[PDB]
């Protein structure tokens, strides 16, 4: 009865969306054929597939997903891929022309000819759902289609539904390992759209994953398959509590009231641990003692921002496996004892605790083997100001004398809008500086 509708738009999301579902598929025992034979279980068990799947009355399960992109290239591979018989035949929206990495195209001219289908699909989707708890949307910010259609879609929801909480996982350009040349433009204007419209944002920069993959997995030539695997874990990591028995269940509704002190400060960064491959794992111990300790290692963070460069504002952790809760308290206490990690003055209690028994599931053929414990660290800190600053520094140099501006201007977007972006992006930064001051 507790269900969440997933929204995926853009090339960046689609593959990460591809990764999340497979593991989601694996965790329930629903093979790509669309069935859940299990140990010949027919009615002799609980009803836990509600959280991410819906019953059709006799047989298969239809995922609660809607897919959006303007280039049929990405959709086609999924439609003819290894999961061709699972997704709804028509809920896989396919476009006609590529967004060509331009925001103006993806937000004012070509993106307005497909939203109608998206909302129609979602409205019907919400109808089936009875215990809607929120929304999870995966999108990319460095692409015209990504920011554009995603921003427009999110805006539409804001008025259509309103108070329904939103949690979105975006992918900002890496600090230095970056591909697109006009990506910063789309990002900032994307930030304005989601700045005052989304509730919880989880930074998921790409470069950080590479080091996590290389250093710990000890892989020197990772591919896009590997990075997607990690993200699916966290996505499955954060929401797995709602659907399995746990000592202290935590609902997606219990993040806006426990992690965002102020309405505008709602940008947060993630990290994951433990990370161990299938070769050097069984000879290591993996105790709650150090697993928590490693989670706070700056080099292990899932984003390229040094937590040592700012105070800590609010934290939230979830435990899994056979963790004895008292073990949870012991790990936290010493962390406070350590002086390297420091909190702000106005947050007396800054640790939210939750324990879910189920062990993380392993998809064969991957990198992470079967461990008996793990922890997901999701914390909001004032240090994230730098990343917004660094993007701002890039914008100023490439906007001082109208770089590639005419491409965006001609599509209809007003020139003065960019002045609006600079005002909002810098305004948020100046907001963050004041927050960290001491009383």
């Amino acid at each position: 009865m507790r269900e969440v509708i997933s929204i995926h738009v853009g090339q960046g999301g689609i593959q990460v969306g591809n990764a999340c579902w497979e593991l989601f598929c694996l965790e329930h025992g629903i093979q790509p054929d669309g069935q859940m034979p299990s140990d010949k279980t027919i009615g002799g068990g609980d009803d836990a597939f509600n959280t991410f799947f819906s019953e059709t009355g006799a047989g298969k399960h239809v995922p609660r997903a809607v897919f959006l992109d303007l280039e049929p290239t990405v959709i086609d591979e999924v439609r003819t891929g290894t999961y061709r018989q699972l997704f709804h035949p028509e809920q896989l929206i396919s476009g006609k022309e590529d967004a060509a990495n331009n925001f103006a195209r993806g937000h004012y001219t070509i993106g307005k000819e497909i939203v109608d289908l998206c909302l129609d699909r979602i409205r019907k989707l919400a109808d089936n759902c009875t215990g809607l708890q929120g929304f999870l949307v995966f999108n990319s910010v460095g692409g015209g289609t990504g920011s554009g259609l995603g921003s427009l879609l999110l805006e539409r929801l804001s008025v259509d539904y309103g108070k329904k909480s939103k949690l979105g996982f975006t992918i900002y350009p890496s600090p230095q390992v970056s591909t697109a040349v006009v990506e910063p433009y789309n990002s900032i204007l994307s930030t304005h759209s989601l700045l005052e419209h989304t509730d919880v944002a989880v930074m998921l920069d790409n470069e950080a994953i590479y080091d996590i993959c290389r250093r710990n997995l000890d892989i020197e030539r990772p591919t896009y398959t590997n990075l997607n695997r990690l993200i699916a874990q966290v996505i499955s990591s954060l929401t797995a509590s709602l659907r399995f028995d746990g000592a202290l269940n935590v609902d997606i509704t219990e993040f806006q009231t426990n992690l965002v002190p102020y309405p505008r400060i709602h940008f947060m960064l993630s990290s994951y641990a433990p990370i161990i491959s299938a070769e050097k794992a069984y000879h290591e111990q993996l105790s709650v003692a150090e697993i928590t300790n490693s989670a706070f290692e700056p080099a292990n963070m899932m984003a390229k921002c040094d937590p040592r460069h700012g105070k800590y504002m609010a934290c939230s952790m979830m435990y899994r496996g056979d963790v004895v809760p008292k073990d949870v308290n012991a790990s936290i206490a010493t962390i406070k004892t350590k002086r390297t990690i420091q909190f702000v003055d106005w947050c007396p209690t800054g640790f939210k605790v939750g324990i879910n028994y189920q062990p993380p599931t392993v998809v064969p053929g991957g990198d992470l083997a079967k461990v008996m414990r793990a922890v997901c660290m999701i914390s909001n800190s004032t240090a994230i100001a730098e990343v917004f600053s660094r993007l701002d520094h890039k914008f100023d140099l490439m906007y001082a004398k109208r770089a590639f501006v005419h491409w965006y201007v001609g599509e209809g977007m007003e020139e003065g809008e960019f002045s609006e972006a600079r005002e909002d992006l810098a305004a948020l930064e100046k907001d963050y500086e004041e927050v960290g001051i001491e009383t």
């Binding site: 054929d33 003819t80 061709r84 018989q85």
Partner: protein, 95 residues
């Protein structure tokens, strides 16, 4: 029974069904081939009677088991029981 031209007639309606379902700029053979490639999962290139029946029902051509078996045997000259849709789609394209 179904020995007489009734089998040929069933093909005529079937050809019409794929023709109606055929997308612009593509022949019916591609439309039938794509459905066969959708249903099959082994990727070997051979499907059983159940897969053939599932493809027919998707196209809307639903008939009794006897008629389905006769149609399968009509194009399954070797009698092995694993028809090759590569030739099955090609025949529709020619027709």
């Amino acid at each position: 029974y179904v020995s007489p031209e009734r089998l040929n007639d069933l093909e005529l309606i079937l050809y019409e069904k794929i023709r109606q379902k055929t997308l612009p700029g593509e022949d019916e053979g591609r439309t039938v081939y794509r459905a066969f490639k959708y249903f099959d999962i082994a990727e070997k290139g051979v499907i059983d009677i159940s897969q053939f029946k599932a493809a027919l029902e998707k196209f809307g051509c639903v008939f009794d088991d006897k008629e389905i078996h006769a149609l399968f045997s009509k194009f399954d000259v070797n009698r092995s029981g694993k028809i090759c849709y590569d030739e099955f789609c090609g025949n529709f394209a020619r027709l």
